[PDB]
């Protein structure tokens, strides 16, 4: 599913991401924009052989099982394919674990490079939330 911007904002808000670990909703929407362009089906191979999955491009070395990433830990206890669903619940639940891991949203290199320190509230501007 390719979410609309406000559509994803609403879903993320309903699933409790607004201000989760202190990160306002615009941060999450901005991260998803640059990670996946709001496409739940997005996948991208990394150099180490892991792959990133879904709206928040969650990696198979640490977080989900894809069966092809040696030394994988599956900390979210989910198949990586669950992160491609039109239903973002699994991505949200796993994102909540990731952002709690110590480095906050710096875990998402796209967020640090493209969202951090910017006017992220612009990403929820115009939405009825």
CSV table of N, CA, C and O in Angstrom, one decimal:
chain,number,residue,atom,x,y,z
A,1,UNK,N,0.9,-1.2,0.0
A,1,UNK,CA,0.0,0.0,0.0
A,1,UNK,C,0.9,1.2,0.0
A,1,UNK,O,1.8,1.3,0.8
A,2,UNK,N,0.6,2.2,-0.9
A,2,UNK,CA,1.2,3.5,-0.8
A,2,UNK,C,0.2,4.4,0.0
A,2,UNK,O,-0.8,4.8,-0.5
A,3,UNK,N,0.6,4.8,1.2
A,3,UNK,CA,-0.1,5.7,2.0
A,3,UNK,C,-0.1,7.1,1.4
A,3,UNK,O,1.0,7.6,1.0
A,4,UNK,N,-1.2,7.8,1.6
A,4,UNK,CA,-1.1,9.3,1.5
A,4,UNK,C,-0.4,9.8,2.8
A,4,UNK,O,-0.3,9.2,3.8
A,5,UNK,N,0.1,11.0,2.7
A,5,UNK,CA,0.8,11.7,3.9
A,5,UNK,C,-0.1,11.8,5.1
A,5,UNK,O,0.2,11.3,6.2
A,6,UNK,N,-1.2,12.4,5.0
A,6,UNK,CA,-2.1,12.5,6.1
A,6,UNK,C,-2.7,11.2,6.6
A,6,UNK,O,-3.0,11.0,7.7
A,7,UNK,N,-3.0,10.3,5.6
A,7,UNK,CA,-3.5,9.0,5.9
A,7,UNK,C,-2.5,8.2,6.8
A,7,UNK,O,-2.9,7.6,7.8
A,8,UNK,N,-1.2,8.3,6.4
A,8,UNK,CA,-0.2,7.7,7.3
A,8,UNK,C,0.0,8.4,8.6
A,8,UNK,O,0.1,7.7,9.7
A,9,UNK,N,-0.1,9.7,8.7
A,9,UNK,CA,-0.1,10.5,9.9
A,9,UNK,C,-1.2,10.0,10.8
A,9,UNK,O,-1.0,9.7,12.0
A,10,UNK,N,-2.4,9.8,10.3
A,10,UNK,CA,-3.5,9.3,11.1
A,10,UNK,C,-3.3,7.9,11.6
A,10,UNK,O,-3.6,7.6,12.8
A,11,UNK,N,-2.7,7.0,10.8
A,11,UNK,CA,-2.5,5.7,11.2
A,11,UNK,C,-1.4,5.6,12.3
A,11,UNK,O,-1.6,4.9,13.3
A,12,UNK,N,-0.3,6.4,12.1
A,12,UNK,CA,0.7,6.4,13.1
A,12,UNK,C,0.2,7.0,14.4
A,12,UNK,O,0.6,6.4,15.5
A,13,UNK,N,-0.6,8.0,14.4
A,13,UNK,CA,-1.2,8.6,15.6
A,13,UNK,C,-2.1,7.6,16.3
A,13,UNK,O,-2.0,7.4,17.5
A,14,UNK,N,-2.9,6.9,15.5
A,14,UNK,CA,-3.8,5.9,16.2
A,14,UNK,C,-3.0,4.8,16.9
A,14,UNK,O,-3.5,4.3,17.9
A,15,UNK,N,-1.9,4.4,16.3
A,15,UNK,CA,-1.0,3.4,16.8
A,15,UNK,C,-0.1,3.9,17.9
A,15,UNK,O,0.7,3.1,18.3
A,16,UNK,N,-0.1,5.1,18.3
A,16,UNK,CA,0.5,5.7,19.4
A,16,UNK,C,2.0,6.1,19.2
A,16,UNK,O,2.7,6.2,20.2
A,17,UNK,N,2.3,6.5,18.0
A,17,UNK,CA,3.6,7.0,17.7
A,17,UNK,C,3.8,8.5,18.0
A,17,UNK,O,4.9,9.0,18.1
A,18,UNK,N,2.7,9.3,18.0
A,18,UNK,CA,2.9,10.7,18.3
A,18,UNK,C,3.4,10.9,19.7
A,18,UNK,O,2.8,10.6,20.7
A,19,UNK,N,4.7,11.5,19.7
A,19,UNK,CA,5.4,11.7,21.0
A,19,UNK,C,6.0,10.5,21.6
A,19,UNK,O,6.3,10.5,22.8
A,20,UNK,N,6.0,9.4,20.9
A,20,UNK,CA,6.6,8.2,21.4
A,20,UNK,C,8.1,8.3,21.6
A,20,UNK,O,8.8,8.8,20.7
A,21,UNK,N,8.6,8.1,22.8
A,21,UNK,CA,10.0,8.4,23.2
A,21,UNK,C,10.3,9.8,22.9
A,21,UNK,O,11.5,10.1,22.7
A,22,UNK,N,9.4,10.7,23.0
A,22,UNK,CA,9.5,12.1,22.7
A,22,UNK,C,9.6,12.6,21.3
A,22,UNK,O,9.9,13.8,21.1
A,23,UNK,N,9.3,11.7,20.3
A,23,UNK,CA,9.4,12.1,19.0
A,23,UNK,C,8.0,12.4,18.4
A,23,UNK,O,7.1,11.5,18.4
A,24,UNK,N,7.8,13.7,18.0
A,24,UNK,CA,6.5,14.2,17.6
A,24,UNK,C,6.2,13.5,16.2
A,24,UNK,O,7.0,13.0,15.5
A,25,UNK,N,4.9,13.4,16.0
A,25,UNK,CA,4.4,12.7,14.8
A,25,UNK,C,5.0,13.1,13.5
A,25,UNK,O,5.3,12.2,12.7
A,26,UNK,N,5.3,14.3,13.3
A,26,UNK,CA,6.0,14.8,12.1
A,26,UNK,C,7.4,14.1,11.9
A,26,UNK,O,7.8,13.9,10.7
A,27,UNK,N,8.1,13.8,12.9
A,27,UNK,CA,9.3,13.0,12.8
A,27,UNK,C,9.1,11.7,12.2
A,27,UNK,O,10.0,11.2,11.4
A,28,UNK,N,8.1,11.0,12.6
A,28,UNK,CA,7.7,9.6,12.1
A,28,UNK,C,7.3,9.7,10.7
A,28,UNK,O,7.7,8.8,9.9
A,29,UNK,N,6.5,10.7,10.3
A,29,UNK,CA,6.0,10.8,8.9
A,29,UNK,C,7.2,11.2,8.0
A,29,UNK,O,7.4,10.6,6.9
A,30,UNK,N,8.0,12.1,8.5
A,30,UNK,CA,9.2,12.5,7.7
A,30,UNK,C,10.2,11.2,7.5
A,30,UNK,O,10.6,11.0,6.4
A,31,UNK,N,10.4,10.5,8.6
A,31,UNK,CA,11.2,9.3,8.5
A,31,UNK,C,10.6,8.3,7.4
A,31,UNK,O,11.3,7.8,6.5
A,32,UNK,N,9.3,8.1,7.5
A,32,UNK,CA,8.7,7.2,6.5
A,32,UNK,C,8.8,7.7,5.1
A,32,UNK,O,9.0,6.9,4.1
A,33,UNK,N,8.6,9.0,4.9
A,33,UNK,CA,8.7,9.6,3.6
A,33,UNK,C,10.1,9.2,3.0
A,33,UNK,O,10.1,8.8,1.8
A,34,UNK,N,11.2,9.5,3.7
A,34,UNK,CA,12.5,9.3,3.1
A,34,UNK,C,13.0,7.9,3.2
A,34,UNK,O,13.8,7.5,2.4
A,35,UNK,N,12.4,7.0,4.1
A,35,UNK,CA,12.8,5.6,4.1
A,35,UNK,C,12.1,4.9,3.0
A,35,UNK,O,12.8,4.0,2.3
A,36,UNK,N,10.8,5.1,2.8
A,36,UNK,CA,10.0,4.2,1.9
A,36,UNK,C,9.1,5.0,0.9
A,36,UNK,O,8.4,4.3,0.1
A,37,UNK,N,9.1,6.3,0.9
A,37,UNK,CA,8.1,7.1,0.2
A,37,UNK,C,6.7,6.7,0.5
A,37,UNK,O,5.8,6.7,-0.4
A,38,UNK,N,6.5,6.3,1.7
A,38,UNK,CA,5.2,5.9,2.2
A,38,UNK,C,4.6,4.6,1.6
A,38,UNK,O,3.4,4.3,1.8
A,39,UNK,N,5.5,3.8,1.1
A,39,UNK,CA,5.1,2.5,0.4
A,39,UNK,C,5.4,1.3,1.4
A,39,UNK,O,6.6,1.0,1.6
A,40,UNK,N,4.4,0.6,1.9
A,40,UNK,CA,4.6,-0.5,2.7
A,40,UNK,C,5.4,-1.6,2.1
A,40,UNK,O,6.0,-2.4,2.8
A,41,UNK,N,5.3,-1.7,0.7
A,41,UNK,CA,6.0,-2.9,0.1
A,41,UNK,C,7.5,-2.6,-0.2
A,41,UNK,O,8.1,-3.5,-0.7
A,42,UNK,N,8.1,-1.5,0.2
A,42,UNK,CA,9.4,-1.1,-0.1
A,42,UNK,C,10.4,-2.1,0.6
A,42,UNK,O,10.3,-2.4,1.7
A,43,UNK,N,11.4,-2.6,-0.2
A,43,UNK,CA,12.5,-3.4,0.3
A,43,UNK,C,13.8,-2.9,-0.3
A,43,UNK,O,13.8,-2.5,-1.4
A,44,UNK,N,14.9,-3.0,0.5
A,44,UNK,CA,16.1,-2.5,-0.1
A,44,UNK,C,17.2,-3.4,0.6
A,44,UNK,O,17.4,-3.4,1.8
A,45,UNK,N,18.1,-4.0,-0.2
A,45,UNK,CA,19.2,-4.8,0.3
A,45,UNK,C,20.3,-3.8,0.8
A,45,UNK,O,20.6,-2.8,0.2
A,46,UNK,N,20.9,-4.2,1.8
A,46,UNK,CA,22.0,-3.5,2.4
A,46,UNK,C,23.3,-4.2,2.0
A,46,UNK,O,23.4,-5.4,1.8
A,47,UNK,N,24.4,-3.5,2.1
A,47,UNK,CA,25.7,-4.1,1.8
A,47,UNK,C,26.1,-5.3,2.6
A,47,UNK,O,26.7,-6.3,2.1
A,48,UNK,N,25.8,-5.4,3.9
A,48,UNK,CA,26.1,-6.5,4.7
A,48,UNK,C,25.3,-7.8,4.4
A,48,UNK,O,25.4,-8.8,5.1
A,49,UNK,N,24.4,-7.7,3.4
A,49,UNK,CA,23.5,-8.9,3.1
A,49,UNK,C,22.1,-8.9,3.8
A,49,UNK,O,21.3,-9.7,3.5
A,50,UNK,N,21.9,-8.0,4.7
A,50,UNK,CA,20.6,-7.8,5.3
A,50,UNK,C,19.8,-7.0,4.3
A,50,UNK,O,20.3,-6.5,3.3
A,51,UNK,N,18.5,-6.9,4.6
A,51,UNK,CA,17.5,-6.2,3.8
A,51,UNK,C,16.7,-5.4,4.8
A,51,UNK,O,16.4,-5.8,5.9
A,52,UNK,N,16.2,-4.2,4.3
A,52,UNK,CA,15.3,-3.3,5.0
A,52,UNK,C,13.9,-3.5,4.4
A,52,UNK,O,13.7,-3.6,3.1
A,53,UNK,N,12.9,-3.5,5.3
A,53,UNK,CA,11.5,-3.8,4.9
A,53,UNK,C,10.5,-2.8,5.4
A,53,UNK,O,10.5,-2.4,6.6
A,54,UNK,N,9.6,-2.4,4.5
A,54,UNK,CA,8.4,-1.7,4.9
A,54,UNK,C,8.6,-0.2,5.0
A,54,UNK,O,9.5,0.4,4.6
A,55,UNK,N,7.5,0.4,5.6
A,55,UNK,CA,7.3,1.8,5.6
A,55,UNK,C,8.5,2.6,6.4
A,55,UNK,O,8.8,3.7,6.1
A,56,UNK,N,9.1,1.8,7.3
A,56,UNK,CA,10.2,2.4,8.1
A,56,UNK,C,11.5,1.6,7.9
A,56,UNK,O,12.5,1.7,8.6
A,57,UNK,N,11.5,0.8,6.8
A,57,UNK,CA,12.8,0.2,6.3
A,57,UNK,C,13.6,-0.5,7.5
A,57,UNK,O,14.7,-0.2,7.7
A,58,UNK,N,12.9,-1.5,8.1
A,58,UNK,CA,13.4,-2.1,9.3
A,58,UNK,C,14.2,-3.3,8.9
A,58,UNK,O,13.9,-4.1,8.0
A,59,UNK,N,15.4,-3.5,9.5
A,59,UNK,CA,16.4,-4.4,9.0
A,59,UNK,C,16.4,-5.8,9.5
A,59,UNK,O,16.1,-6.0,10.7
A,60,UNK,N,16.7,-6.8,8.7
A,60,UNK,CA,16.7,-8.2,9.0
A,60,UNK,C,17.9,-8.7,9.7
A,60,UNK,O,17.9,-9.8,10.1
A,61,UNK,N,18.9,-7.9,10.0
A,61,UNK,CA,20.1,-8.4,10.8
A,61,UNK,C,19.7,-8.4,12.3
A,61,UNK,O,20.1,-9.2,13.0
A,62,UNK,N,18.9,-7.4,12.7
A,62,UNK,CA,18.5,-7.3,14.1
A,62,UNK,C,17.1,-7.6,14.4
A,62,UNK,O,16.8,-8.1,15.5
A,63,UNK,N,16.2,-7.1,13.6
A,63,UNK,CA,14.8,-6.9,14.0
A,63,UNK,C,13.7,-7.9,13.5
A,63,UNK,O,12.8,-8.2,14.2
A,64,UNK,N,13.9,-8.4,12.3
A,64,UNK,CA,12.9,-9.3,11.8
A,64,UNK,C,13.6,-10.5,11.1
A,64,UNK,O,14.8,-10.4,10.7
A,65,UNK,N,12.9,-11.6,10.9
A,65,UNK,CA,13.5,-12.8,10.2
A,65,UNK,C,13.1,-12.8,8.7
A,65,UNK,O,11.9,-12.9,8.4
A,66,UNK,N,14.1,-12.8,7.9
A,66,UNK,CA,13.8,-13.1,6.4
A,66,UNK,C,14.4,-14.4,5.9
A,66,UNK,O,14.3,-14.6,4.7
A,67,UNK,N,15.1,-15.2,6.8
A,67,UNK,CA,15.6,-16.4,6.4
A,67,UNK,C,16.9,-16.4,5.6
A,67,UNK,O,17.4,-17.5,5.2
A,68,UNK,N,17.4,-15.2,5.2
A,68,UNK,CA,18.6,-15.2,4.4
A,68,UNK,C,19.7,-14.3,5.0
A,68,UNK,O,20.6,-13.9,4.2
A,69,UNK,N,19.6,-13.9,6.2
A,69,UNK,CA,20.6,-12.9,6.8
A,69,UNK,C,21.3,-13.6,8.0
A,69,UNK,O,20.9,-13.8,9.0
A,70,UNK,N,22.5,-14.2,7.7
A,70,UNK,CA,23.2,-14.9,8.8
A,70,UNK,C,23.5,-14.1,10.0
A,70,UNK,O,23.7,-12.9,9.9
A,71,UNK,N,23.4,-14.6,11.3
A,71,UNK,CA,23.6,-13.8,12.5
A,71,UNK,C,22.4,-12.9,12.8
A,71,UNK,O,22.5,-11.9,13.6
A,72,UNK,N,21.3,-13.2,12.2
A,72,UNK,CA,20.1,-12.4,12.4
A,72,UNK,C,19.6,-12.7,13.8
A,72,UNK,O,19.6,-13.9,14.3
A,73,UNK,N,19.1,-11.7,14.5
A,73,UNK,CA,18.5,-11.8,15.8
A,73,UNK,C,17.0,-11.8,16.0
A,73,UNK,O,16.5,-12.2,17.1
A,74,UNK,N,16.3,-11.3,15.0
A,74,UNK,CA,14.8,-11.3,15.1
A,74,UNK,C,14.2,-10.7,16.5
A,74,UNK,O,13.4,-11.3,17.1
A,75,UNK,N,14.7,-9.5,16.9
A,75,UNK,CA,14.3,-9.0,18.1
A,75,UNK,C,12.8,-8.6,18.2
A,75,UNK,O,12.3,-8.5,19.3
A,76,UNK,N,12.2,-8.2,17.1
A,76,UNK,CA,10.8,-8.0,17.0
A,76,UNK,C,9.9,-9.2,16.9
A,76,UNK,O,8.7,-9.1,17.0
A,77,UNK,N,10.6,-10.4,16.8
A,77,UNK,CA,9.9,-11.7,16.7
A,77,UNK,C,8.8,-11.7,15.6
A,77,UNK,O,7.6,-12.0,15.9
A,78,UNK,N,9.2,-11.4,14.4
A,78,UNK,CA,8.2,-11.3,13.3
A,78,UNK,C,8.9,-11.6,12.0
A,78,UNK,O,10.1,-11.3,11.8
A,79,UNK,N,8.2,-12.3,11.1
A,79,UNK,CA,8.8,-12.4,9.7
A,79,UNK,C,8.9,-11.0,9.1
A,79,UNK,O,8.0,-10.2,9.2
A,80,UNK,N,10.0,-10.7,8.4
A,80,UNK,CA,10.1,-9.4,7.7
A,80,UNK,C,8.9,-9.2,6.8
A,80,UNK,O,8.6,-8.0,6.6
A,81,UNK,N,8.4,-10.2,6.1
A,81,UNK,CA,7.2,-10.0,5.3
A,81,UNK,C,6.0,-9.3,6.0
A,81,UNK,O,5.2,-8.6,5.4
A,82,UNK,N,5.9,-9.5,7.3
A,82,UNK,CA,4.8,-8.8,8.1
A,82,UNK,C,5.0,-7.3,8.0
A,82,UNK,O,4.0,-6.6,8.2
A,83,UNK,N,6.2,-6.9,7.8
A,83,UNK,CA,6.5,-5.4,7.7
A,83,UNK,C,6.1,-4.8,6.3
A,83,UNK,O,6.2,-3.6,6.1
A,84,UNK,N,5.6,-5.6,5.4
A,84,UNK,CA,5.1,-5.1,4.1
A,84,UNK,C,3.6,-5.0,3.9
A,84,UNK,O,3.1,-4.5,2.9
A,85,UNK,N,2.9,-5.4,5.0
A,85,UNK,CA,1.5,-5.4,5.0
A,85,UNK,C,0.9,-4.0,4.8
A,85,UNK,O,1.5,-3.0,5.2
A,86,UNK,N,-0.3,-3.9,4.3
A,86,UNK,CA,-1.1,-2.7,4.3
A,86,UNK,C,-1.4,-2.2,5.7
A,86,UNK,O,-1.6,-1.0,5.9
A,87,UNK,N,-1.5,-3.1,6.6
A,87,UNK,CA,-1.7,-2.8,8.1
A,87,UNK,C,-0.4,-2.6,8.7
A,87,UNK,O,0.5,-3.5,8.8
A,88,UNK,N,-0.2,-1.3,9.1
A,88,UNK,CA,1.1,-1.0,9.7
A,88,UNK,C,1.4,-1.4,11.2
A,88,UNK,O,2.5,-1.1,11.7
A,89,UNK,N,0.5,-2.2,11.8
A,89,UNK,CA,0.7,-2.5,13.2
A,89,UNK,C,2.1,-3.1,13.5
A,89,UNK,O,2.8,-2.7,14.4
A,90,UNK,N,2.5,-4.1,12.7
A,90,UNK,CA,3.8,-4.8,12.9
A,90,UNK,C,5.0,-3.9,12.8
A,90,UNK,O,5.9,-3.9,13.6
A,91,UNK,N,4.9,-3.0,11.8
A,91,UNK,CA,6.0,-2.0,11.6
A,91,UNK,C,6.0,-1.1,12.8
A,91,UNK,O,7.1,-0.7,13.3
A,92,UNK,N,4.8,-0.6,13.3
A,92,UNK,CA,4.8,0.3,14.4
A,92,UNK,C,5.3,-0.4,15.7
A,92,UNK,O,6.2,0.2,16.4
A,93,UNK,N,4.9,-1.6,15.9
A,93,UNK,CA,5.3,-2.2,17.2
A,93,UNK,C,6.9,-2.4,17.2
A,93,UNK,O,7.5,-2.3,18.2
A,94,UNK,N,7.4,-2.8,16.0
A,94,UNK,CA,8.8,-3.0,15.9
A,94,UNK,C,9.6,-1.7,16.0
A,94,UNK,O,10.6,-1.6,16.7
A,95,UNK,N,9.1,-0.6,15.3
A,95,UNK,CA,9.6,0.7,15.4
A,95,UNK,C,9.7,1.2,16.9
A,95,UNK,O,10.7,1.9,17.3
A,96,UNK,N,8.7,0.9,17.6
A,96,UNK,CA,8.7,1.3,19.1
A,96,UNK,C,9.9,0.6,19.8
A,96,UNK,O,10.6,1.3,20.6
A,97,UNK,N,10.2,-0.6,19.5
A,97,UNK,CA,11.3,-1.3,20.1
A,97,UNK,C,12.6,-0.6,19.6
A,97,UNK,O,13.5,-0.4,20.4
A,98,UNK,N,12.7,-0.4,18.3
A,98,UNK,CA,14.0,0.2,17.8
A,98,UNK,C,14.3,1.5,18.4
A,98,UNK,O,15.4,1.8,18.8
A,99,UNK,N,13.3,2.4,18.5
A,99,UNK,CA,13.5,3.7,19.0
A,99,UNK,C,13.8,3.8,20.5
A,99,UNK,O,14.3,4.8,21.0
A,100,UNK,N,13.5,2.7,21.2
A,100,UNK,CA,13.8,2.6,22.6
A,100,UNK,C,15.1,2.0,22.8
A,100,UNK,O,15.5,1.8,24.0
A,101,UNK,N,15.9,1.6,21.8
A,101,UNK,CA,17.1,0.8,21.9
A,101,UNK,C,18.3,1.6,22.4
A,101,UNK,O,19.3,1.0,22.8
A,102,UNK,N,18.2,2.9,22.5
A,102,UNK,CA,19.3,3.8,23.0
A,102,UNK,C,19.6,5.1,22.3
A,102,UNK,O,20.0,6.1,22.9
A,103,UNK,N,19.6,5.0,21.0
A,103,UNK,CA,19.9,6.1,20.1
A,103,UNK,C,18.7,6.8,19.5
A,103,UNK,O,18.9,7.7,18.6
A,104,UNK,N,17.6,6.5,20.0
A,104,UNK,CA,16.4,7.2,19.6
A,104,UNK,C,16.2,7.1,18.1
A,104,UNK,O,16.5,6.0,17.5
A,105,UNK,N,15.8,8.1,17.4
A,105,UNK,CA,15.5,8.0,16.0
A,105,UNK,C,16.8,8.1,15.1
A,105,UNK,O,16.7,7.9,13.9
A,106,UNK,N,17.9,8.3,15.7
A,106,UNK,CA,19.2,8.2,14.9
A,106,UNK,C,19.4,6.8,14.4
A,106,UNK,O,20.2,6.6,13.5
A,107,UNK,N,18.6,5.8,14.9
A,107,UNK,CA,18.6,4.4,14.3
A,107,UNK,C,18.3,4.5,12.8
A,107,UNK,O,18.7,3.6,12.1
A,108,UNK,N,17.4,5.4,12.4
A,108,UNK,CA,17.1,5.6,11.0
A,108,UNK,C,18.0,6.6,10.4
A,108,UNK,O,18.0,7.8,10.7
A,109,UNK,N,19.0,6.2,9.6
A,109,UNK,CA,20.0,7.1,9.1
A,109,UNK,C,19.3,8.2,8.2
A,109,UNK,O,19.7,9.3,8.3
A,110,UNK,N,18.3,7.8,7.5
A,110,UNK,CA,17.5,8.8,6.7
A,110,UNK,C,16.9,9.8,7.6
A,110,UNK,O,16.8,11.0,7.2
A,111,UNK,N,16.3,9.4,8.7
A,111,UNK,CA,15.9,10.5,9.6
A,111,UNK,C,17.0,11.4,10.1
A,111,UNK,O,16.8,12.6,10.1
A,112,UNK,N,18.2,10.9,10.5
A,112,UNK,CA,19.2,11.8,10.9
A,112,UNK,C,19.6,12.7,9.8
A,112,UNK,O,19.8,13.9,10.0
A,113,UNK,N,19.7,12.2,8.6
A,113,UNK,CA,20.2,13.0,7.5
A,113,UNK,C,19.2,13.9,6.8
A,113,UNK,O,19.7,14.9,6.2
A,114,UNK,N,18.0,13.6,6.9
A,114,UNK,CA,17.0,14.4,6.2
A,114,UNK,C,15.8,15.0,7.0
A,114,UNK,O,15.1,15.8,6.5
A,115,UNK,N,15.7,14.5,8.2
A,115,UNK,CA,14.6,15.0,9.1
A,115,UNK,C,15.1,15.7,10.3
A,115,UNK,O,14.5,16.8,10.7
A,116,UNK,N,16.1,15.2,11.0
A,116,UNK,CA,16.6,15.8,12.2
A,116,UNK,C,17.0,17.2,12.1
A,116,UNK,O,17.7,17.6,11.1
A,117,UNK,N,16.4,18.1,12.9
A,117,UNK,CA,16.8,19.5,12.9
A,117,UNK,C,16.0,20.3,11.9
A,117,UNK,O,16.2,21.6,11.8
A,118,UNK,N,15.1,19.7,11.1
A,118,UNK,CA,14.3,20.4,10.2
A,118,UNK,C,12.9,20.6,10.8
A,118,UNK,O,12.5,20.1,11.8
A,119,UNK,N,12.1,21.4,10.0
A,119,UNK,CA,10.7,21.7,10.4
A,119,UNK,C,9.9,20.5,10.1
A,119,UNK,O,9.1,20.4,9.2
A,120,UNK,N,9.9,19.5,11.0
A,120,UNK,CA,9.2,18.2,10.7
A,120,UNK,C,7.7,18.4,10.9
A,120,UNK,O,7.0,17.6,10.3
A,121,UNK,N,7.3,19.3,11.6
A,121,UNK,CA,5.8,19.6,11.7
A,121,UNK,C,5.2,19.9,10.3
A,121,UNK,O,4.0,19.5,10.1
A,122,UNK,N,6.0,20.3,9.4
A,122,UNK,CA,5.4,20.5,8.0
A,122,UNK,C,4.9,19.2,7.5
A,122,UNK,O,3.9,19.3,6.7
A,123,UNK,N,5.4,18.1,7.9
A,123,UNK,CA,4.9,16.8,7.4
A,123,UNK,C,3.5,16.5,7.9
A,123,UNK,O,2.8,15.6,7.3
A,124,UNK,N,2.9,17.1,8.9
A,124,UNK,CA,1.5,16.8,9.4
A,124,UNK,C,0.6,18.1,9.1
A,124,UNK,O,-0.6,18.0,9.4
A,125,UNK,N,1.2,19.1,8.5
A,125,UNK,CA,0.5,20.4,8.2
A,125,UNK,C,-0.7,20.1,7.2
A,125,UNK,O,-0.5,19.3,6.3
A,126,UNK,N,-1.8,20.7,7.5
A,126,UNK,CA,-3.0,20.4,6.7
A,126,UNK,C,-3.8,19.2,7.0
A,126,UNK,O,-4.9,19.1,6.6
A,127,UNK,N,-3.3,18.3,7.8
A,127,UNK,CA,-4.0,17.0,8.2
A,127,UNK,C,-5.0,17.3,9.3
A,127,UNK,O,-4.7,18.0,10.2
A,128,UNK,N,-6.1,16.6,9.2
A,128,UNK,CA,-7.1,16.5,10.3
A,128,UNK,C,-6.9,15.3,11.2
A,128,UNK,O,-7.3,14.1,10.9
A,129,UNK,N,-6.2,15.6,12.3
A,129,UNK,CA,-5.7,14.5,13.2
A,129,UNK,C,-6.2,14.6,14.6
A,129,UNK,O,-6.3,13.5,15.2
